[PDB]
């Protein structure tokens, strides 16, 4: 299977302007009739190359004439000798029941539904399956009325009829041209939650949420988030929905989280269904963020789409930025920034040093579904955010407005978007564009000096990005580098030079650069890379006291958290080295004291305190090291937890009790208090065993909501408390019939620190709530084991690797997209010690040998073995 390259992009030889589809639907054999109006733009001798995969062709007509000038090759139907304008009619057959890959048209339970992004439409009919070809669709669907009473596609119901033999049809029309990745079709039986939203100019939009029969009780939060999403986009971006109806369908069987199909989003039911006894605060916030995300794509993705798939970030990075701003405006900005930065430094950095490293705009791709990445999404968004940081809100909004004014109704490029921001703002973003073409994480090194004779503070900032597996050449970037300088009272010193204010966002554009500030009347404590102003590794020689001083005085709550992370980092590294030498945890009294002060500070926002009291995950810890020792990291997180539990037991308990809430509310202050309370519980679980066991069992049984129940159950597993097996058994007995709820329990099993966890995971393949046919169940058991239990996954006997090989040998054939997400842990072999690396390499070599190796895996494996 061969790589496509971004610099090979060329405009298509043909366009399609309109497509009329008819689906005679049936799970065994669906007959598809596609009538496209087409226009030749290239040369007469150039043929029309239509993509198609696993299609049985029935016939080809050109202006109603049966066509003899064509041939089928691998993945294509090539048609010659066409006039300039013509009508193409294709009839073909497909088989949804056989589609275990869940790409194109497939079954989810008794429903039929689609997934077309990136290149799924070509599994439905022969088409120009590329996103610079935009067409107006009309979709007629014919099906059995009893199995499929709801027949849905994009746009508005414009026709309908009854047929003989219990069949009926419905025809839909969507007036906006679209690329085919945004086609959807759903056929099934559903309960439907109906509501409306009136836009700010007065358009009444009908909202419809389709869920499986029985689940209407879990739907109102998603509807409420949808309305909140529509409203925020109006207030913040000035954007209104542009259709009459907005449908979302919740399906249980989905490779993805959710998909923005125009006017008919299809969502994984994990991002829709919530009730207080089944869903945590985190699930509610996620539903809100994901509903918003797909909604935001209506502009940033649909009204302006992507010229080609190498431009994916144009929509996903910008739309992530949007969903982050939405969550942040509605909730706690600081908590959002904090967690997004956790993801960046702990997962996206790992990617950007792995064999799969790529720029946010890739240059080379073999399987495009492999590039829906942490890089494209999260670093993508950080790149948008830097543009925002350089321009300010007002200018950023002007650039958004110019982007739409220019590109509404067409497919654009990343470079188009940058250009609009540049032209609208008059900020020069030439050098800035290098963030789109250069992979890897820059290292920004800072040295300082205070001169008391001249009252000048001097910052010497330098950058470099190391070579990555994909690129040997690197150059300096335009790094927006935000600073604040604090005096000995905790006040900000005005930034100035030669009697003029200076912007506090410094433009770090060279390999090495000095900035000098004047009238710095006291030696400053600096806050550097404020709010993570660029997605870079900061190297600065902090003292502990500088960091604790920032924990106390920094203006932005993010910086208080960040200082505390820098404070811990030094001691995480210390203690991992110690653990390798068989030594126990060492932690200075003054560090413990800094955390005691956060617990007992009565002015601190509880939401902030909770994050400072949530230790960096094993993944964030892992990025502090060149070579990763996953067992030492896991053990050091546990020991650091046990030591703060002991040092802070009385304060932990007091704060636990003080934050008790009798009423459960999905409201930001309540969530903050609850998050702090459960953070204290976590520590307490690792303290004195009998208290631990009592607190945890009691919270589990008395909880009036799943947040509090799961925090307890999870602490029981994490600390291996006596009550653990009984609580786990109870949860299963109550919840086994509910897949989404069981996902959490599978995650807990998979991430257990118990010595026999692998054996338990193998056995859970036979559990009544588990099935290899369901991507969620697979992600929750196997994915969680491999990706989120690195200690057990990297057991020295290599048992973890052999297990993953066995699961991937199945999934490579069954559902390559899922297999590909699951292989990610194995491709990080170069970060491990030689012996682990040998075993991971043999594992990869074995998968490389599979018969019918999917392209999705092939891409990753060959990069990993290079």
């Amino acid at each position: 299977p061969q790589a496509k390259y971004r610099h090979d992009y060329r405009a298509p030889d043909y366009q399609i302007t309109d497509i009329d589809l008819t689906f005679d639907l049936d799970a065994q054999k669906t007959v598809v009739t596609a009538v496209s109006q087409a226009v030749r733009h290239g040369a007469s001798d150039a043929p029309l190359r239509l993509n198609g995969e696993d299609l049985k062709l029935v016939s080809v007509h050109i202006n109603d004439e049966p066509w003899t000038a064509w041939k089928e090759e691998e993945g294509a139907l090539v048609i010659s000798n066409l006039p300039e304008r013509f009508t193409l009619k294709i009839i073909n057959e497909i088989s949804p029941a056989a589609n275990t890959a869940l790409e194109g048209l497939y079954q989810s339970g008794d429903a039929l539904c689609t997934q077309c992004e990136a290149e799924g439409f070509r599994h439905i009919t022969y088409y120009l399956d590329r996103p610079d070809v935009l067409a107006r669709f009309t979709t007629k669907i014919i099906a059995d009325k009893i199995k499929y009473p709801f027949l849905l596609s994009n746009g508005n119901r414009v026709a309908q009829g009854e047929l003989e033999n219990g069949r009926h049809w419905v025809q839909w029309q969507d007036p906006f041209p679209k690329p085919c990745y945004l086609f959807a079709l759903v056929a099934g039986d559903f309960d439907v939650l109906r509501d409306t939203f009136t836009t700010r100019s007065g358009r009444e939009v009908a909202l419809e949420l389709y869920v499986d029969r029985g689940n209407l009780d879990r739907a109102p939060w998603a509807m409420t988030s949808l309305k909140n999403s529509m409203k925020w986009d109006e207030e913040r971006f000035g954007l209104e929905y542009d259709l009459d109806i907005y449908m979302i369908v919740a399906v249980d069987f989905f490779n993805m989280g959710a998909m923005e199909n125009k006017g008919l989003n299809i969502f994984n039911s994990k991002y829709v269904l919530a009730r207080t006894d089944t869903a945590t605060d985190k699930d509610y916030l996620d539903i809100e963020r994901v509903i918003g995300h797909e909604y935001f794509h209506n502009w940033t993705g649909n009204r302006v789409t992507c010229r080609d798939w190498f431009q994916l970030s144009l929509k996903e990075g910008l739309t992530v930025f949007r969903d982050q701003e939405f969550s942040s405006d509605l909730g706690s900005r600081a908590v959002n920034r904090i967690n997004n930065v956790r993801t960046m430094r702990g997962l996206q950095f790992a990617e950007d040093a792995s064999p799969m490293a790529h720029p946010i705009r890739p240059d080379m791709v073999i399987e495009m579904n492999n590039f829906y990445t942490l890089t494209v999404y999260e670093k993508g968004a950080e790149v948008i955010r830097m543009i925002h940081t350089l321009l300010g809100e007002e200018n950023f909004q002007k650039g958004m407005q110019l982007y739409f004014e220019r590109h509404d109704g067409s497919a654009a490029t990343c470079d188009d978007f940058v250009q609009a921001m540049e032209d609208a703002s008059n900020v020069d973003l030439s050098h800035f564009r290098r963030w789109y073409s250069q992979s890897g994480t820059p290292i920004v090194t800072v040295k300082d000096d205070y001169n008391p004779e001249t009252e000048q503070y001097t910052l010497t900032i330098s950058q470099r990005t190391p070579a990555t597996p994909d690129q040997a050449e690197k150059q300096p970037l335009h790094i927006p580098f935000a600073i604040e300088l604090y005096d000995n009272e905790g006040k900000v010193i005005p930034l100035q030079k030669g009697g003029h204010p200076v912007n506090s966002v410094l433009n770090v554009t060279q390999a090495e650069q000095t900035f000098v500030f004047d009238n710095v009347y006291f030696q400053p404590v600096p806050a550097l890379l404020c709010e993570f102003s660029a997605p870079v590794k900061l190297e600065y020689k902090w003292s502990d006291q500088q960091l604790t001083f920032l924990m106390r005085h920094a203006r932005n709550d993010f910086s208080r958290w960040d200082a505390a992370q820098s404070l811990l980092a030094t001691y995480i590294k210390l203690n991992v080295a110690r653990h390798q030498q068989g030594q126990p945890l060492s932690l200075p009294v003054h560090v413990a004291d800094a955390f005691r002060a956060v617990l007992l500070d009565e002015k601190i926002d509880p939401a902030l305190a909770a994050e400072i009291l949530t230790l960096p995950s094993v993944n964030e810890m892992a990025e502090l090291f060149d070579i990763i020792d996953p067992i030492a990291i896991a053990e050091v997180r546990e020991a650091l937890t046990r030591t703060l539990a002991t040092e802070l037991a009385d304060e932990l308990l007091a704060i636990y009790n003080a934050n008790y809430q009798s009423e459960y509310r999905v409201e930001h202050e309540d969530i903050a208090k609850r998050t702090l309370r459960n953070a204290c519980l976590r520590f307490l679980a690792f303290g004195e065993t009998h208290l631990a066991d009592v607190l945890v069992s009691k919270q589990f049984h008395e909880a009036n909501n799943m947040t509090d129940a799961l925090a307890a159950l999870s602490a029981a597993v994490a600390a291996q408390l006596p009550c653990r097996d009984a609580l786990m058994q109870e949860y299963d007995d109550k919840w086994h019939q509910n897949g989404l709820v069981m996902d959490k329990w599978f995650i807990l099993q998979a991430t257990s620190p118990a010595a026999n966890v692998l054996e338990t995971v193998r056995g859970l393949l036979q559990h009544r709530s588990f099935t290899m046919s369901n991507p969620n169940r697979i992600r929750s058991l196997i994915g969680a084991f491999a990706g989120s239990n690195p200690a057990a996954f990297h057991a020295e006997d290599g048992s973890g690797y052999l297990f993953l090989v066995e699961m991937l040998t199945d999934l490579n054939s069954r559902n390559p997209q899922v297999a590909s997400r699951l292989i990610e842990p194995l491709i990080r072999l170069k970060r491990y010690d030689a012996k682990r690396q040998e075993k991971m390499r043999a594992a990869l070599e074995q998968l490389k040998g599979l018969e019918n190796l999917s392209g999705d895996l092939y891409e990753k494996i060959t990069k990993a073995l290079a």
Binding site: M256, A258, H293, E294, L312, R779
Partner: peptide, 4 residues
């Protein structure tokens, strides 16, 4: 797209 949200992937996971």
């Amino acid at each position: 797209x949200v992937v996971d």
